[PDB]
Amino acid sequence: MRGLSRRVQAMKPSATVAVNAKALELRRQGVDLVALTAGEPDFDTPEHVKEAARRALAQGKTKYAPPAGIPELREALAEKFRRENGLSVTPEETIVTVGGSQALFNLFQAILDPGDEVIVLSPYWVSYPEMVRFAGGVVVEVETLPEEGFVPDPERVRRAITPRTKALVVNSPNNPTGAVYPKEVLEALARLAVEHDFYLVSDEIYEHLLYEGEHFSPGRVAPEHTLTVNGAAKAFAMTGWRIGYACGPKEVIKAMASVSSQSTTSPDTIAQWATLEALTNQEASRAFVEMAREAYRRRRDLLLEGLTALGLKAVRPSGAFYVLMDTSPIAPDEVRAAERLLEAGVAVVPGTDFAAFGHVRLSYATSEENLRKALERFARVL
Amino acid sequence: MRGLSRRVQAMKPSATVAVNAKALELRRQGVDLVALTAGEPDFDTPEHVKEAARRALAQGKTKYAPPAGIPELREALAEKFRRENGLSVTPEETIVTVGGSQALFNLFQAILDPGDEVIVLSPYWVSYPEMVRFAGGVVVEVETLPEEGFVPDPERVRRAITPRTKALVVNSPNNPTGAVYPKEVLEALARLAVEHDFYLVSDEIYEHLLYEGEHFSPGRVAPEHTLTVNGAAKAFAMTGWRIGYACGPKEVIKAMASVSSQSTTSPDTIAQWATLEALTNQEASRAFVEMAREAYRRRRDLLLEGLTALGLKAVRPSGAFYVLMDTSPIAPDEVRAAERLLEAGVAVVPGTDFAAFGHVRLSYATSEENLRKALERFARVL
Numbered sequence: 001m002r003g004l005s006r007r008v009q010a011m012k013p014s015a016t017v018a019v020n021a022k023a024l025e026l027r028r029q030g031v032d033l034v035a036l037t038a039g040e041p042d043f044d045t046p047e048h049v050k051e052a053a054r055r056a057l058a059q060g061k062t063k064y065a066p067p068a069g070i071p072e073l074r075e076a077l078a079e080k081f082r083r084e085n086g087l088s089v090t091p092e093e094t095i096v097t098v099g100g101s102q103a104l105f106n107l108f109q110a111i112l113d114p115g116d117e118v119i120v121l122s123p124y125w126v127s128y129p130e131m132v133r134f135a136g137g138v139v140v141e142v143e144t145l146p147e148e149g150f151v152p153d154p155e156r157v158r159r160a161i162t163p164r165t166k167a168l169v170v171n172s173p174n175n176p177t178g179a180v181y182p183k184e185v186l187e188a189l190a191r192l193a194v195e196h197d198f199y200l201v202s203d204e205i206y207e208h209l210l211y212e213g214e215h216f217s218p219g220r221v222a223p224e225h226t227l228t229v230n231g232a233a234k235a236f237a238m239t240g241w242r243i244g245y246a247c248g249p250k251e252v253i254k255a256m257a258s259v260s261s262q263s264t265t266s267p268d269t270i271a272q273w274a275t276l277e278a279l280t281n282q283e284a285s286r287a288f289v290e291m292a293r294e295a296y297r298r299r300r301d302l303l304l305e306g307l308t309a310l311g312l313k314a315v316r317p318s319g320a321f322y323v324l325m326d327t328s329p330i331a332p333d334e335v336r337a338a339e340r341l342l343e344a345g346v347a348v349v350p351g352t353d354f355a356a357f358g359h360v361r362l363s364y365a366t367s368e369e370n371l372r373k374a375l376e377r378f379a380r381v382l
Numbered sequence: 383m384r385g386l387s388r389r390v391q392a393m394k395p396s397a398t399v400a401v402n403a404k405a406l407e408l409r410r411q412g413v414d415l416v417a418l419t420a421g422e423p424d425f426d427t428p429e430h431v432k433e434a435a436r437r438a439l440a441q442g443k444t445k446y447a448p449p450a451g452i453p454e455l456r457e458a459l460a461e462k463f464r465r466e467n468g469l470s471v472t473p474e475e476t477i478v479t480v481g482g483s484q485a486l487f488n489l490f491q492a493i494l495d496p497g498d499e500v501i502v503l504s505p506y507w508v509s510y511p512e513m514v515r516f517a518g519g520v521v522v523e524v525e526t527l528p529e530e531g532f533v534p535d536p537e538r539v540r541r542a543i544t545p546r547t548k549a550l551v552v553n554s555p556n557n558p559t560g561a562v563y564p565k566e567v568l569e570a571l572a573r574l575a576v577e578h579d580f581y582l583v584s585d586e587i588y589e590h591l592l593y594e595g596e597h598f599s600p601g602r603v604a605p606e607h608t609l610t611v612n613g614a615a616k617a618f619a620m621t622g623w624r625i626g627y628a629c630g631p632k633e634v635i636k637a638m639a640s641v642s643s644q645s646t647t648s649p650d651t652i653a654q655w656a657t658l659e660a661l662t663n664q665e666a667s668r669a670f671v672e673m674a675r676e677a678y679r680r681r682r683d684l685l686l687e688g689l690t691a692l693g694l695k696a697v698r699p700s701g702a703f704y705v706l707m708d709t710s711p712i713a714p715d716e717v718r719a720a721e722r723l724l725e726a727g728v729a730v731v732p733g734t735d736f737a738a739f740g741h742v743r744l745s746y747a748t749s750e751e752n753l754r755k756a757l758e759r760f761a762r763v764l
């Protein structure tokens with residue numbers, strides 16, 4: 001018999017896609033749009049990393065690599081996690097994946113049985129519920145509030161814990177809120193995992209995109225319960241290279257490697273060698289990170305000042321490059337609001353898919369010139 | 383609760399790993415071993431491919447690409463499948479993946495529900511039964527005989543069909559046997575798919591490594607029932623770039639792309655542009671393929687002659703770069719024969735994991751000198 005499987009037919013339709021279609025038809029008819037939808041840095045990948053790629057090519061490093069990644073990179077990862085994050089991990093507790101997205105995918109496939117529950121904090125990155133459901137898991141949502149700066153309340157999270165809880169996903173700095181969680185909150189969440197016996201999944205890919213505060217890794221207090229996900233995508237403008245990495249409990253890391261061996265085999269060899277350089281040449285990478293950080297901060301300040309002048313509400317973010325704007329004064333709901341802005345000449349992402357109802361996500365990974373234009377168009381709508 | 387999923391724990395041990403452990407121990411204690419274990423070309427990837435990669439780097443093509451692959455590549459794939467395989471496909475019925483292995487992985491996740499049966503023809507590539515069982519499928523084995531040149535009998539396959547049969551996997555040229563199936567057998571297998579309503583999965587990655595006969599794609603006779611898997615890995619010596627592709631029913635291709643968006647997002651962008659060059663620059667690419675076919679042919683003949691003179695049995699291969707050798711005159715089983723050969727100074731792959739019992743896989747993807755050096759060491763195990 002023919003026909004698709006139940007797991008693939010169950011995939012929910014994105015609201016972001018429908019808005020995006022209307023954006024394309026407008027472009028076709030000559031309409032000038034300013035896009036504030038980018039989920040990746042506007043800067044190109046730094047030359048020290050590109051150069052390392054060129055060397056690998058000439059050195060003929062074009063053969064299959066081990067499922068968990070070339071050993072040199074696994075060693076550099078153990079160094080990065082300890083030095084930058086205060087995490088006590090060995091090279092064997094590290095893994096290279098096809099982007100941080102595959103680390104999360106392999107992780108869920110490795111720890112979830114049909115029926116297992118995963119607590120997610122809304123607004124959340126679109127992929128979390130999809131991944132949990134594709135592995136037969138049950139999504140249990142806990143909401144963070146705008147009035148609380150979108151920082152989780154440990155008390156609201158405890159109420160979502162049941163005998164079936166397998167994991168808790170935390171993402172700080174956060175996409176789409178841009179919130180940075182204080183160390184006290186993160187320690188409180190780690191404590192819940194220890195007491196209730198479940199995994200704490202910490203998505204930290206935005207660690208270097210920080211404007212105020214400190215990036216705390218919960219793996220510092222509960223290493224055997226925490227699975228730290230990270231990658232080179234957002235920090236070094238390497239989204240198209242597809243290189244991510246994680247660390248955590250030996251048996252879980254080993255399980256994730258077995259999944260890669262039956263699916264992707266191993267990440268692109270040239271990209272693994274280029275990433276080793278990004279981690280080893282701290283001087284050149286630090287220079288790129290500081291340059292991007294100062295640029296994003298100027299862009300963020302400019303945006304918030306403008307939004308405030310227009311009377312538009314948006315919680316001030318401390319990390320990443322996003323801003324959740326309240327659309328109440330523009331329309332009754334975020335989808336209708338996003339369509340109105342398109343007609344005004346500004347492309348935004350509706351908050352529907354992130355569970356950020358009544359809000360729209362704005363990205364400041366664009367030039368200041370583009371941010372000023374958008375603010376002008378916002379004024380016209382009001 | 384903490385712990386691993388059943389799907390990850392269901393994966394059983396490999397005989398290849400166990401013998402490779404002793405092989406690494408001997409290499410460690412100053413032992414010289416000739417390796418005939420390679421599953422990838424010994425040639426480095428051609429310069430024009432490397433050159434397309436450098437251009438992409440210099441042009442800033444390092445951003446996220448669409449889930450099914452960049453539009454330029456999907457269009458080139460349609461042409462390749464039409465021109466080389468006589469398949470009538472559109473760019474929309476085409477998909478780019480992270481290696482041919484991911485194409486197969488996403489396929490089974492998209493079409494298999496727990497209990498659905500898949501028919502594999504033994505000896506088979508180690509990954510087939512792994513991917514089927516991971517998706518909840520049930521493996522049904524149909525044996526191919528050495529006396530029949532490892533070519534399948536449609537009648538034997540027919541007897542294996544039940545109401546629960548979801549797919550049939552065909553691999554020609556074959557790994558590990560090296561057999562090339564005749565157009566008539568492929569047509570017969572395709573018709574069983576249409577007659578009994580199920581999917582025919584055709585793994586054609588070795589299509590260009592053919593010494594005698596013609597390559598036939600069963601998709602020509604059963605388009606609505608056939609998923610054709612291929613890739614740049616073996617033909618253009620690009621195993622480390624991780625780029626594969628497939629074509630087939632529009633709705634299946636669409637479901638495979640959704641699995642990608644939730645896991646790997648999209649294959650490495652630099653590698654996608656490089657692959658486009660390997661498909662469009664026909665003159666440079668054919669020159670490489672022809673040069674490789676010539677070399678593989680010389681090595682094959684050299685190997686078979688040496689085996690025959692030694693009094694060892696082996697079915698003459700028509701494609702790929704493998705040879706299954708009968709280990710009866712050496713040891714009771716293939717694992718012990720593999721261990722005796724190691725001590726004689728030769729590393730080979732036991733046939734256990736491919737279900738090729740009493741046989742050992744030899745790879746001639748190395749220099750003639752190494753092949754000669756290996757045959758010479760074979761005298762010590764008679």
Ligand SMILES: *Cc1c(COP(=O)(O)O)cnc(C)c1O
Pocket residue numbers: 098099100101102125171175203205231232233234239242243244647
């Ligand atoms: C970008 C991102 C990731 C991973 O991205 P990759 O491109 O797959 O490395 C994971 N989590 C969040 C919240 C992200 O924004």
Ligand SMILES: *Cc1c(COP(=O)(O)O)cnc(C)c1O
Pocket residue numbers: 265480481482483484507553556557585587613614615616621625626
């Ligand atoms: C090498 C191979 C593949 C795919 O390899 P990728 O490196 O993932 O492109 C598929 N089938 C067989 C039989 C192979 O030998």
